[PDB]
Design a protein around this ligand. Structure first.
Ligand SMILES: *[C@@H]1O[C@H](CO)[C@@H](O[C@@H]2O[C@H](CO)[C@@H](O[C@@H]3O[C@H](CO[C@H]4O[C@H](CO[C@H]5O[C@H](CO)[C@@H](O)[C@H](O)[C@@H]5O[C@H]5O[C@H](CO)[C@@H](O)[C@H](O)[C@@H]5O)[C@@H](O)[C@H](O[C@H]5O[C@H](CO)[C@@H](O)[C@H](O)[C@@H]5O)[C@@H]4O)[C@@H](O)[C@H](O[C@H]4O[C@H](CO)[C@@H](O)[C@H](O)[C@@H]4O[C@H]4O[C@H](CO)[C@@H](O)[C@H](O)[C@@H]4O[C@H]4O[C@H](CO)[C@@H](O)[C@H](O)[C@@H]4O)[C@@H]3O)[C@H](O)[C@H]2NC(C)=O)[C@H](O)[C@H]1NC(C)=O
Ligand SMILES: *[C@@H]1O[C@H](CO)[C@@H](O[C@@H]2O[C@H](CO)[C@@H](O[C@@H]3O[C@H](CO[C@H]4O[C@H](CO[C@H]5O[C@H](CO)[C@@H](O)[C@H](O)[C@@H]5O[C@H]5O[C@H](CO)[C@@H](O)[C@H](O)[C@@H]5O)[C@@H](O)[C@H](O[C@H]5O[C@H](CO)[C@@H](O)[C@H](O)[C@@H]5O)[C@@H]4O)[C@@H](O)[C@H](O[C@H]4O[C@H](CO)[C@@H](O)[C@H](O)[C@@H]4O[C@H]4O[C@H](CO)[C@@H](O)[C@H](O)[C@@H]4O[C@H]4O[C@H](CO)[C@@H](O)[C@H](O)[C@@H]4O)[C@@H]3O)[C@H](O)[C@H]2NC(C)=O)[C@H](O)[C@H]1NC(C)=O
Ligand SMILES: *[C@@H]1O[C@H](CO)[C@@H](O[C@@H]2O[C@H](CO)[C@@H](O[C@@H]3O[C@H](CO[C@H]4O[C@H](CO)[C@@H](O)[C@H](O[C@H]5O[C@H](CO)[C@@H](O)[C@H](O)[C@@H]5O)[C@@H]4O)[C@@H](O)[C@H](O[C@H]4O[C@H](CO)[C@@H](O)[C@H](O)[C@@H]4O[C@H]4O[C@H](CO)[C@@H](O)[C@H](O)[C@@H]4O)[C@@H]3O)[C@H](O)[C@H]2NC(C)=O)[C@H](O)[C@H]1NC(C)=O
Ligand SMILES: *[C@@H]1O[C@H](CO)[C@@H](O[C@@H]2O[C@H](CO)[C@@H](O[C@@H]3O[C@H](CO[C@H]4O[C@H](CO)[C@@H](O)[C@H](O[C@H]5O[C@H](CO)[C@@H](O)[C@H](O)[C@@H]5O)[C@@H]4O)[C@@H](O)[C@H](O[C@H]4O[C@H](CO)[C@@H](O)[C@H](O)[C@@H]4O[C@H]4O[C@H](CO)[C@@H](O)[C@H](O)[C@@H]4O)[C@@H]3O)[C@H](O)[C@H]2NC(C)=O)[C@H](O)[C@H]1NC(C)=O
Ligand SMILES: OC[C@H]1O[C@@](CO)(OC[C@@]2(O[C@H]3O[C@H](CO)[C@@H](O)[C@H](O)[C@H]3O)O[C@H](CO)[C@@H](O)[C@@H]2O)[C@@H](O)[C@@H]1O
Ligand SMILES: OC[C@H]1O[C@@](CO)(OC[C@@]2(O[C@H]3O[C@H](CO)[C@@H](O)[C@H](O)[C@H]3O)O[C@H](CO)[C@@H](O)[C@@H]2O)[C@@H](O)[C@@H]1O
Ligand SMILES: *[C@@H]1O[C@H](CO)[C@@H](O)[C@H](O)[C@H]1NC(C)=O
Ligand SMILES: *[C@@H]1O[C@H](CO)[C@@H](O)[C@H](O)[C@H]1NC(C)=O
Ligand SMILES: *[C@@H]1O[C@H](CO)[C@@H](O)[C@H](O)[C@H]1NC(C)=O
Ligand SMILES: *[C@@H]1O[C@H](CO)[C@@H](O)[C@H](O)[C@H]1NC(C)=O
Ligand SMILES: *[C@@H]1O[C@H](CO)[C@@H](O)[C@H](O)[C@H]1NC(C)=O
Ligand SMILES: *[C@@H]1O[C@H](CO)[C@@H](O)[C@H](O)[C@H]1NC(C)=O
Ligand SMILES: *[C@@H]1O[C@H](CO)[C@@H](O)[C@H](O)[C@H]1NC(C)=O
Ligand SMILES: *[C@@H]1O[C@H](CO)[C@@H](O)[C@H](O)[C@H]1NC(C)=O
Ligand SMILES: *[C@@H]1O[C@H](CO)[C@@H](O)[C@H](O)[C@H]1NC(C)=O
Ligand SMILES: *[C@@H]1O[C@H](CO)[C@@H](O)[C@H](O)[C@H]1NC(C)=O
Ligand SMILES: *[C@@H]1O[C@H](CO)[C@@H](O)[C@H](O)[C@H]1NC(C)=O
Ligand SMILES: *[C@@H]1O[C@H](CO)[C@@H](O)[C@H](O)[C@H]1NC(C)=O
Lengths: 624, 624
């Protein structure tokens, strides 16, 4: 095993465990110290204002198993500190018959058991578990634990009648899944249900959704309500909140609803952020965010989606969330988005970016798998004075339109996402910032034009505003992690409305994924404008490439170039001419970003272990 | 619910939990503080000379489940103190994927991991588990834990490759069971295998048996040897030690070998007690003790047996224990005998006495189930100068015979059992002792003759020597727990060789078992004697009646008389005449015995709990 990054890569499968630990590793974002991670969980803002972030964790392994909550905290979403207790950075782990198969995703009741922060989580036990298997009742249940030390440790309720697990009966037969409880308060839902509480007797101030579906008949999001305020044992099933069809698709802008939901949550937003009104705010919109499985040919069969919904009250005292429009939270290699409330009327969302090594060829050599996305403020994105001649505008696919009284302009509403300002400020302030001169891309434009200032490593951010003609057929964008022989191309093609990440040359190492990523982006044309603009921001962080367009479209992906000098970046141009010109302005490079884990050494591997021959006997975990 | 024991019992099923806690409860023996107990486990003499006793335990329940090690200690086998830690009186419990279904029986390596006492135990996980089910590999494995605080707590080895569980591969396919590891040192077996260690490479000083069987083909005791001295991870399977047939019986004196062995152990004894010679002691005999299941129509389908064995060395470096003669360790409601070494060349055996409420009618009202037997010294019982005209003597069923050179007398050898002297001394010294005049039972004998001194409660011991004519047809014995309306009759009938416990009148409460207990007892007639003698000792301890004959035959059973005055005792006589006389001598009553748990209050119930609806979902434990 040679680690010489000045020559072509050898057979890297001969390299030892964690020998490639630092080679491709993000430095500027949330990531476990080592080993396997997946979904964010247990997210909450603590009493001191800091953020507690949990994650699905399997230390010293590079595949999923014995799944536990790893945890850390931060005052600014950006610089983090690991918890360190008797189980290292874990704070909840399988320990009881009801959760011994895995401590799955859960969410936080801020004022819970004895007034303490309390997690409601999916406690798993034995038996077939999965949307494509014959799962039975009891395999997935929902259980409580609380913390008396602000997340350093959690105490589970006892096992038994009137204690854990607190939710165990399936609300309908033949479920594809029954997990990922999302607990939330909702003045909106309370107001809607207030006239029906005699029917159900459920009057608590917390609601919970559980994600699942029904075999052969599509996904379901089940709504429960806390039966009595201040009491956390009894949760009353109201009814299905979201019901979709077996592999139903709302269309090209909306992914596919698959067969089963995972990590679903419910929020209410207005243009500024989170909305906590009872329905009286006419600018507020109700949203559900949710993962779907088995409705996609690639990306691990997973779509991270969202929908704007209009609530209807059923005669039996339940709520139907009728989908008004439906979109995609991230178009790339991410999933398991969780959102949580943050002071100052914010709702913040974060997901998991998986690797692109699905055949598990170099995972042991990494010594870890997975990272988070950046933390994102959610809000209602409102675009005013939109031209009615914007192509495809009245499809109203993942947005709504409201015509002006005179019919000459439109107001567009959709889900907005932007990186939390704390992270952008910290990134910029710790980076070498190069403000770049604007560039007209015309007949003289090369295919690739390096920026006048270059990155010094694989940790940087770039932004630019690309102004296109209304009938352009030109393509433009950014090339990143670039040398002569390796590079990743991010293109926007206004004629097709497609944002693509072409990865055919991303790496000389042939075992990593190289499929082209694709997102749809609607450039809402403004009344009186003779052009249309794409604001494109890209974060490069080890192997992560995380792309944001117009505070709306997100696409996370992976690139693993071998060569030490595959760090460059610049502008891409295709079919730009004297007549079909792309004006690029607002160009800026941030080199360095932030060291997100200042207390960690460069190599936090503790080695990898094998569970031994019993892993295959039990049949629950891969064992490595 | 009336608790008036001066009148007939009402409907006691209306009584609350643990309302009958003290009514029938043993006071003079080892018993858990409350709830369910079964098999003794983890038995060892600690460095300070005290005895550590573990037991299969399910606190706050009255059926088996979440099975754990409860523990206590004693300096004299007789007066005990509970451990008290974070889990009350438990010291090992289900906590890992490999043992979450139950911490089953295990035994002690005195100088184990890092020099500490170490338990090798059956760690159970999910799946069908049982001799009549389709069990698979992995459901029962064997794991290690060690104690740094003399049994107050145990630390398990980690889960994984080269750690726990340490034995997981089935030695043969289609096992009926794979549990109850019994670890022991054996100069005998080491000497026998010393010439074959090149074949197996197993040279350690500890052996371990694992109890089981093969579907359709009878029970098996599998022999392992520690691969290397001072190392405890690697155990090498040598071969089957004991192989018996599907429901094979050695005869009327030997129970039935059933389909599967449980709690089997291996020892070597001589007339004084334990023998640690390499084979050079010609007075020493190798014994296996073992439970069998599904070879009995009653007594929970369970026989606690023993066999004298002659070891043969196989060509593959394993040992065949060929059964020379075969007997019964206890003929009544006991099972799960464990034996362990005690200083002064002793091997001490103790079992579990279950209740006689198999339909679980009053178990909740008790608030507990089960107790131990008394602790018993094992030894080789040798009877000299036996008359060749002793009926059935040369059947050599559960004994061996050696003729004198002249053929006129025989030496009989069998397994001896007697209550440990520490317990007899403590019992006698703390009791009101009445030494009773001898009684000739003849034509004037009533059916029942009360002793001249009577017990004052349900805690007493009695002994007597019954001298019978060689051709008697008379029966005699003891009546205990007796009033006019309730009593339990213990009869010996020399003509049939049957010791019986008739329980048709044991209690006015009709839900308890009332079947007649039966043991075979061989009165070895002595050359020149014109009579034959039965030495019969009976311990009455709450509901336990524990009977010993001739330091050889043991029979444990249960009686639950309701009336407060059903405590009396005396002599039984049937068919005694002027000519057929039974001389009773050496009569003595010990009233009171010992308070075995002096620190415990009278009622140590902590209430009972229900596991809730998930118990049936998981399908592992009854849930109460
Ligand atoms: C199979 O068997 C298994 C083993 O038996 C069984 O698991 C066990 O289940 C039981 C029962 O559910 C659990 O017991 C509970 O424990 C809770 C606390 O748990 C935390 O702390 C314990 C103990 O910690 C000590 O010991 C450890 C180990 O040495 C140390 O690490 C600690 O530092 C600490 O040490 C100190 O104390 C020791 C003595 O205890 C000393 O020896 C020592 O020197 C130190 O001084 C830990 O062991 C726990 O860890 C385990 O669990 C966590 C997850 O929780 C895992 O991550 C971890 O790996 C371990 O597995 C854990 O950290 C108790 O709070 C709980 O007690 C209450 O609940 C019951 C009702 O169910 C009540 O009877 C009781 O009164 C308590 O409730 C009161 O208090 C709470 C708040 O405190 C209130 O909310 C409640 O309303 C109530 O209030 C009352 O009192 C108030 C105040 O007075 C009053 O105001 C009110 O009005 C009211 O009256 C319970 O004891 C046990 O933890 C499990 N153990 C394990 C190992 O799993 C399993 O379930 C079985 N399975 C099946 C299928 O049956
Ligand atoms: C799913 O995830 C699960 C959770 O992660 C996982 O279970 C966990 O598995 C790990 C890995 O196997 C276990 O970790 C081991 O722990 C052993 C000790 O275990 C006992 O103590 C711990 C910790 O106790 C502290 O914390 C608790 C809880 O707060 C307190 O109650 C205690 O009082 C104590 O508190 C103090 O310390 C804290 C910090 O640790 C402080 O915060 C605190 O303030 C106090 O100061 C307990 O938690 C354990 O309880 C659990 O387990 C018991 C059964 O064992 C249960 O009954 C109970 O309910 C709990 O479940 C327990 O009591 C460690 O000994 C062990 O460490 C060694 O082994 C590894 C190799 O595997 C080595 O890397 C390491 O070096 C250690 O080995 C050395 O030392 C031993 C002797 O000590 C030697 O034999 C050995 O050769 C080696 O020697 C070396 O050093 C020598 C000396 O320098 C030298 O001479 C030699 O030459 C050599 O170099 C390991 O860390 C962990 O306990 C499990 N936890 C739980 C909750 O289950 C599970 O397996 C996963 N499942 C799957 C399927 O993957
Ligand atoms: C005395 O000790 C007991 C522990 O032994 C304590 O707890 C009680 O334990 C008993 C079992 O011994 C429980 O009985 C079972 O109850 C089931 C139905 O429960 C629901 O209704 C009752 C009555 O209104 C409620 O009290 C329960 O509420 C509690 O539990 C819920 C969770 O469900 C919690 O949310 C609450 O907070 C409470 O904790 C429940 O709502 C019942 O299905 C079950 O069924 C069988 O058993 C009886 C008797 O054998 C049969 O008649 C019947 O046919 C069923 O038999 C089954 O047999 C086998 C399985 O064994 C199957 O093959 C069959 O098909 C069949 O299903 C049983 O009756 C009791 O619920 C529980 N009480 C609790 C927790 O409060 C007592 O509390 C304790 N007393 C005191 C004062 O401390
Ligand atoms: C680097 O990290 C790893 C952890 O990932 C550490 O541990 C190693 O982990 C790997 C798995 O990643 C283990 O590989 C597996 O080994 C199985 C056979 O093991 C035995 O032989 C080896 C080699 O001589 C011994 O080292 C082992 O000894 C250890 O374990 C025993 C317990 O058995 C202990 O008693 C010892 O003390 C040791 O701890 C064993 O004796 C092997 O069966 C398994 O099989 C497959 O995997 C490969 C690669 O994918 C395939 O080629 C092959 O076809 C098998 O594929 C399976 O795929 C699926 C299941 O995934 C099935 O559907 C198929 O049917 C098929 O079975 C695998 O190769 C390795 O044993 C283990 N080593 C240990 C514990 O020492 C490393 O130690 C660590 N390195 C360092 C330096 O720290
Ligand atoms: O960690 C559990 C947690 O993650 C979620 C959301 O993705 O489900 C994950 C899921 O897959 C994981 O487990 C498999 C092991 O077979 C592993 O290959 C995969 O990489 C993991 O993401 O967990 C169940 C059980 O494995 C799968 O059906 C599901 O796809 C979330 O729903 C859950 O709380
Ligand atoms: O506690 C386990 C321990 O006991 C032994 C010896 O008797 O096996 C007991 C055994 O039965 C127990 O469990 C059943 C529950 O179905 C209960 O009804 C019974 O009263 C208990 O004695 O355990 C297994 C699994 O339950 C049974 O097949 C077996 O009969 C010993 O072998 C083991 O270590
Ligand atoms: C980058 O590295 C490769 C391999 O060392 C080399 O061939 C190339 O010239 C380097 N310089 C660049 C891309 O500017
Ligand atoms: C569907 O549900 C029932 C239990 O409600 C179960 O018997 C059945 O096996 C399930 N699965 C299928 C494939 O029908
Ligand atoms: C309420 O009605 C809806 C629509 O029919 C149904 O899906 C849901 O199960 C009902 N809620 C119940 C039975 O609690
Ligand atoms: C919205 O505006 C467009 C363009 O003026 C028009 O075609 C459409 O009918 C309008 N919709 C409504 C509801 O008035
Ligand atoms: C650098 O990053 C840290 C950690 O996020 C942040 O607190 C600090 O303000 C940043 N430095 C600047 C803006 O100069
Ligand atoms: C644009 O994307 C869609 C997928 O939504 C695809 O069908 C189409 O071929 C793409 N067109 C171009 C030119 O990239
Ligand atoms: C024993 O008690 C019962 C019921 O109180 C009574 O009938 C009987 O006379 C009592 N005395 C005895 C058996 O000596
Ligand atoms: C017997 O053993 C094999 C595995 O060795 C297994 O396939 C089979 O199902 C077992 N049970 C029966 C009843 O044959
Ligand atoms: C040794 O031979 C015996 C008798 O054939 C056999 O039962 C046992 O399995 C053998 N031991 C092995 C293969 O380790
Ligand atoms: C043992 O003694 C009996 C009675 O004397 C006799 O019948 C039998 O043959 C003797 N056995 C041997 C081996 O000499
Ligand atoms: C009474 O019993 C205790 C506890 O077993 C024992 O130590 C003591 O010697 C006994 N009293 C006597 C013999 O007087
Ligand atoms: C004595 O016991 C045996 C069982 O071993 C039985 O067959 C026989 O009938 C009994 N005889 C009498 C008279 O009790």
């Amino acid at each position: 095993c040679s680690l010489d990054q000045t020559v072509a890569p050898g057979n890297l499968t001969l390299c030892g465990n964690a020998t490639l630990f630092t080679t491709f590793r993000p430095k500027a974002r949330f990531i476990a110290p080592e080993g396997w991670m997946n979904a964010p969980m247990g997210l909450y803002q603590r009493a001191d204002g800091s953020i507690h972030a949990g994650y699905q964790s399997h230390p010293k392994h590079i595949q999923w198993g014995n799944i536990s909550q790893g945890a850390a905290y931060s005052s600014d979403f950006t610089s983090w500190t690991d918890f360190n207790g008797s189980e290292g950075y874990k704070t909840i782990w399988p320990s009881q018959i009801y959760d011994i198969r895995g401590v799955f995703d859960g969410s936080i009741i801020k004022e819970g058991i004895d007034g303490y922060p309390t997690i409601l989580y999916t406690s798993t036990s034995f038996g077939p578990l999965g949307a494509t298997l014959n799962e039975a009742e009891g395999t997935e249940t929902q259980s409580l634990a609380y913390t008396t030390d602000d997340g350093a440790s959690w105490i589970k309720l006892g096992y038994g009648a009137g204690q854990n697990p607190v939710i165990y009966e399936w609300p309908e037969t033949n479920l594809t899944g029954f997990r990922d409880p999302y607990v939330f308060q909702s003045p909106r839902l309370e107001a809607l249900l207030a006239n029906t509480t005699s029917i159900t007797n459920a009057t608590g101030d917390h609601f919970a959704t559980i994600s699942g579906g029904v075999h052969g008949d599509g996904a379901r999001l089940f709504l429960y309500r806390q039966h009595t305020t201040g009491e956390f044992i009894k949760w009353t099933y109201l009814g299905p909140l979201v019901t979709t069809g077996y592999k139903e698709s709302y269309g090209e802008w909306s992914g596919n609803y698959g067969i089963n939901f995972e990590t679903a949550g419910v929020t209410r937003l207005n243009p500024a952020g989170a909305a906590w009104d009872n329905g009286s705010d006419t600018t507020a919109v109700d949203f559900v965010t949710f993962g779907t499985e088995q409705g996609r040919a690639d990306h691990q069969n997973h779509w991270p989606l969202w929908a704007a919904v209009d609530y209807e009250v059923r005669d039996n005292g339940s709520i139907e969330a009728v989908i008004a429009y439906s979109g995609v939270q991230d178009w790339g290699r991410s999933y398991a988005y969780a959102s949580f409330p943050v002071e100052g009327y914010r709702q913040v969302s974060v997901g998991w970016i998986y690797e692109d090594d699905d055949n598990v060829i170099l995972a042991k050599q990494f010594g870890y798998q997975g990272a988070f996305t950046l933390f994102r403020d959610l809000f209602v994105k409102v675009v005013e004075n939109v031209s009615p001649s914007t192509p495809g505008l009245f499809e109203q696919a993942s947005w709504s339109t409201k015509n002006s009284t005179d019919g000459m302009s439109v107001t567009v509403t959709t889900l907005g996402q932007r990186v939390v300002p704390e992270t952008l400020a910290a990134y910029k302030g710790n980076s070498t910032v190069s403000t770049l001169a604007p560039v007209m891309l015309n007949e003289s434009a090369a295919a690739y034009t390096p920026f006048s200032s270059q990155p010094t490593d694989r940790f940087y951010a770039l932004t630019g505003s690309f102004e296109f003609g209304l009938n352009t057929t030109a393509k433009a964008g950014f090339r990143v992690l670039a040398s002569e022989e390796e590079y990743t191309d991010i293109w926007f093609d206004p004629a097709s409305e497609n944002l693509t990440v072409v990865r055919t040359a991303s790496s000389l190492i042939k075992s990593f994924g190289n499929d082209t990523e694709l997102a749809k982006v609607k450039l809402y044309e403004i009344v009186g404008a003779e052009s249309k603009t794409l604001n494109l921001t890209v974060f490069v962080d080890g192997s992560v490439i995380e792309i944001y367009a117009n505070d709306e479209v997100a696409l996370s992906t992976r690139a693993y170039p071998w060569l030490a000098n595959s760090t460059g970046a610049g502008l891409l141009a295709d079919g730009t001419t004297a007549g079909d010109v792309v004006g690029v302005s607002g160009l800026e490079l941030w080199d360095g970003l932030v060291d997100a884990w200042p207390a960690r050494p460069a190599n936090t591997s503790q080695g990898l272990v094998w569970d031994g021959p019993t892993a295959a006997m039990y049949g629950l975990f891969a064992g490595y």
